[PDB]
Amino acid sequence: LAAQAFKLLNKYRPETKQEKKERLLREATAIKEVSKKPYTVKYGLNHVVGLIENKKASLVLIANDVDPIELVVFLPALCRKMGIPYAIIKGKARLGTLVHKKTAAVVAITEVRSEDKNELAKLISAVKEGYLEKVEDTRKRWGGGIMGFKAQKREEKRK
Amino acid sequence: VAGLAPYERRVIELLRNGKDKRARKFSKKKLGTFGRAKRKCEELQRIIAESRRAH
Amino acid sequence: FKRAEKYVKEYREQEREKIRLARIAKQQGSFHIPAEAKLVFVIRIKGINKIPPKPRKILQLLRLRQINNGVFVKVTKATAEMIKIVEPWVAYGYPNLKSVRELIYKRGYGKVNGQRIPLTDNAIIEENLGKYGIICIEDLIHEIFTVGPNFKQAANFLWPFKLSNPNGGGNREEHINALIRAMN
Amino acid sequence: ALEKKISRALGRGDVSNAARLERNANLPEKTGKPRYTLNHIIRERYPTFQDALRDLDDCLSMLFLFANLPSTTAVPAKMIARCER
Amino acid sequence: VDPDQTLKACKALLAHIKKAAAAPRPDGKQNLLADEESTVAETPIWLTLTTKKHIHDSHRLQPGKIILPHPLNTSEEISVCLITADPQRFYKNAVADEFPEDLRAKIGRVIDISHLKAKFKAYEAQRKLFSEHDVFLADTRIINRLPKALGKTFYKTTTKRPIPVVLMAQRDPLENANARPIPEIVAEIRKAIGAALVHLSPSTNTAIKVGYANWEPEKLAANIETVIRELVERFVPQKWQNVRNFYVKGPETAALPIYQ
Amino acid sequence: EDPYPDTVEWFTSVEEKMPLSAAPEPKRRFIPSKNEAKQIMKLVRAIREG
Amino acid sequence: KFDQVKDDQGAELAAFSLEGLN
Amino acid sequence: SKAAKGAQAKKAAQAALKGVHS
Amino acid sequence: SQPGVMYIARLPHGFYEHELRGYFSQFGEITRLRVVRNKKTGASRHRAFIEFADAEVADIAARTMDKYLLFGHILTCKIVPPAQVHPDLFKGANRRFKVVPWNKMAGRQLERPLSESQWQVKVAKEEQRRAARAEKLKEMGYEFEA
């Protein structure tokens, strides 16, 4: 599911500083001598959570390793209340790769072109029946319980 | 998301058990004023009400 | 361990090729080329991991098995359909004099007793063939640029050329002569 | 540090940033001109044109030997094509 | 085949459709979007050819067109979609420049082959293009691309299939398209819409559209007589001997025999 | 006493359909970007001057 | 100056034309 | 026997879920 | 030795007999496998039955491929209960469902000549049905002379 999500998401990468500077140089030299809405992956916490609060986001992808965890700890509940399907992926560095930054705490998809309206819909379902209805019981339940042999013998000695 | 404080969990347990007077007096000693005891017990009683609505 | 990702892809490439191969035999094997006999230098490039059985016999016939080999062929109505089967794994184009003369001089290998020896002496040439009208390497060089009846043995004498892999440098008419210069 | 920057865009998957950083690298496989500029070093090593002709003895012997040799990873066909030219 | 029997054949059938459509509803649900006059207007009437041998040869299995003395689709109601090649903007400007009266109003969408493979790749979009537009025109180059981009729901389940149009003259898409002159472009389109489409299936029973039910009876009679004449000479193999029984038929009614 | 309990969704179990913000969308979200149009004409002025 | 077509055709020494004056 | 089949099934499940690389 | 019955649907085009066998054989020993196809043309109905030597390795294989996005299809892998399995699930195990050219054979059988007596019963079936069609077409009000 990670590879299929990033296959769609790589197709909607933002433009880097080089090809944006060349693209602005395009329209400047043509003005010397007609565009539709750009569609990019949306990033930034306050930008993304503003989008999911306004129901403009289609899919939300959240990193698992935000060093202050509070910045994303409300995100799974907010996405579930608002109705946007979300997913949780390994690597904020992997999301920064998509964004052309170092780290991205969260990314979102709002609207895609009509070439792949079907591809996003199948990914939206695949995230829902493959990830969302599998962690449903584990959303509410606590962690812990990975005690080893040394911890078990120490606990038996203490008790 | 956050859950409850340890003191709020005790007030919750008394409110399900029906000991409203004990929960109100416990909120007085913990928070400090009677109007804050009324406010916290009202918010927690609305939490128990909305809990069984989802249940 | 190999995934069901690759299983569906491998079977999709196999049905696509079988349809195209059975397209080719069912249709007439005629190319839009003049009937005058010409010469092709042809180079194997890895197309797909699995391979179908009719090209299996014919790639062993061109001894074109290892990665990035080349050999010189002469087109007929027969040899065209041999080429017109093996397209996705090979590249076919007309050589030039500078390209052919360099390639054998930089890399010249011959076949005697099932051994791959270099081309060190012209006395080795006469010890190998001798009585076929050839006198040195330049006799074989001229034999490549204009095809004679003895080219069949000269192709059999010549080992496939193990070229170097380029780092980024169907039909291409002059772009393969750019590909030899990029990867020799 | 620039060779580290070439593997940056390869690691990011940025093909365009890989194209321009190799162009900033001016790597000798795609150019044929040598990677480093040694005009000052040659000027310091040879004080006169006569000494350049004295080292042209081994230079032209090296040039014609390695113009006859085929291409490898160290010496590509572009650099031999510049050498024989 | 004689004119007078097929003259009286269309009287009895067309009265039956007009009688059956004027019949009331077996419950108390009247129809909002179907007027009585508009009910009998839309329904096509076709003939069906029943031959005695299978049509296996590829020299006849390809689709084709008959010109009639009265064209088939002509109402403003139909929307025409043209499948083109290479540029799409150039043909979009072509319909934005050439003909105001019947061309732009009938033509619903000009759409490229590359955009067909990309945008309408899935089955949902394939079925929504099938429903939206009424007739379909394809460049003679593009037809061999089409039944892979277009599906079984598009191609084989229905007689409504893309129609060959010639758009070549006698390659970088941005530079220049190999195309034939603009005022002669529409001339092939005019013959394309007004044409009885024919596609001979492998088996022995085929059905060719000849008209609708709102027309005047002898106006059908001249259309069918040309349709029998053109089919047996051009497409039907083994000349005038292969045919066994012809019929004249409406949507849900029976089939009225004409023998050959 | 159960020491650390299960969490019940008493608020997220219901899903509301409207966005929280009732504020109108600005026009800037429907038109070509004025901020880039300034940047382009700055590049035009630099190219005119050479 | 030199011609790439002559060099590709095999001129070698013949493709290179030398002009006396700049 | 049964433990070896369970071990090879867990190894196949781990490779299908987490990968073989590292 | 309890076998497991596993049902795989939403099957992508190309995930047929041998590749479906080749994939889950890596998971465990496969007893037999049969993907259902269509009568008229050889064409898969995107649904298959595969049986493992061990029931425990079937549950491992089913839960590891329960929801998997492959070629635009989210396959459903689910274990059929042992009490809910018809014993005739494998009348066609492990063999070929050959693509029989039904339309071609039936089409030309019309074209090879018959027996002379067989032509007369062809006519005998023929004249009894034109009168039958003429009877029901008399109600509309059209009659055919020939």
Add this chain to the structure above:
RNA sequence: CAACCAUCAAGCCCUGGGCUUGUGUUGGGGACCCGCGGCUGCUCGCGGGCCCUGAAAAGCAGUGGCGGGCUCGCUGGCGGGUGCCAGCCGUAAAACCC
């Protein structure tokens, strides 16, 4: 898990335009219409017409053969089988491979 048939040829006719080949497509469902092959018959196949379905799905698999593998015996040779063939064809027979 990429793309990749022809970003147009060839041959004709009555030399200016048209004709003919370049075989390709998901599966189901309706308590709907008709044509043609079979069944004594209920009904089963072939073909089109109308409608519905996220690239959806919980048995119903049945048609005659050509060659090949694992085998059961007899003298590398011969005779029968195979919940066989990512090989063919349509029932005689061929073709491919080594």
